[PDB]
């Protein structure tokens, strides 16, 4: 019954600003406590801040590295939670959730102000903070050889290097080749550019008869590259 939908996320330059929205329905939004929670890429959850209900005068508590820059607000009339962000840093990436905060306090063992738990969550919206501009992918072939062969089957692929922003879709032989093909996840270099690899395993007795071409596509930079991989 409870529904939570975040929105307003995207790419933004360092020092810039952005306002995330969150709609709620299926419960009493007017008296319910709300909390924003983020998950940096490759890391775990991180408490941002909490907005209280009417009884507490809508008081808001932020995190230490957050306070003085972010601002939480709510509109009970339209059931919308807002997170205004100013002077955005790169560390503020990437994903932000809004959650319905519950309140717990055992009388005999609890200690004030008790504890806060989160009953319901949303899908969250992605907020990427980078100073890098759009760039096309530099494709390099991963040619098969004695250093990269094993029995009747051999391994060859492509190296999609230095592109931005995500994503890059790589197929083979106009999508005809799908078996044994594995597209690895992209790694984010210190330069602020993405890089991945698309490999495919094939019989060694097919290098003379069949030709292999990887089809890299990067819509953010409007670049399609058809690169043929041949043995050394």
């Amino acid at each position: 019954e409870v529904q939570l939908v975040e929105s307003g996320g995207g790419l933004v330059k360092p020092g810039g600003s952005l306002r995330l929205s969150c709609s709620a329905s299926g419960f009493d939004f007017d008296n319910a406590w709300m909390t924003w929670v983020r998950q940096p890429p490759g890391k775990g959850l991180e408490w941002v801040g909490r907005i209280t209900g009417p009884g507490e005068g809508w008081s808001v508590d932020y995190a230490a590295p957050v306070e003085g820059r972010f601002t939480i607000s709510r509109l009970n009339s339209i059931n919308f939670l807002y997170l205004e962000m100013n002077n955005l840093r790169m560390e503020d990436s990437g994903l932000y959730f809004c959650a319905r905060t519950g309140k717990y306090y055992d009388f005999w063992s609890g200690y004030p102000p008790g504890e806060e738990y989160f009953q319901d969550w949303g899908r969250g919206t992605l907020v990427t903070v980078s100073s890098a501009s759009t760039k096309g992918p530099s494709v390099f072939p991963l040619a098969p050889s004695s250093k990269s062969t094993s029995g009747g089957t051999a391994a060859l692929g492509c190296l999609v290097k230095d592109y931005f922003p995500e994503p890059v879709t790589v197929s083979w032989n106009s999508g005809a080749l799908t078996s044994g093909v594995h597209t690895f996840p992209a790694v984010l270099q210190s330069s602020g550019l993405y890089s991945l690899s698309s490999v495919v395993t094939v019989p060694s007795s097919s290098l003379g008869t069949q030709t292999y071409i990887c089809n890299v596509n990067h819509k953010p930079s409007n670049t399609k590259v058809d690169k043929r991989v041949e043995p050394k």
Binding site: G55, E56, G110, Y111, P112, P113, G114
Partner: peptide, 17 residues
């Protein structure tokens, strides 16, 4: 006003001591 959650949790704990 007794509706401050912080006032209540504090209201309730002193009654132990």
């Amino acid at each position: 006003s007794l509706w401050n959650w912080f006032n209540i949790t504090n209201x309730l704990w002193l009654i132990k001591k």
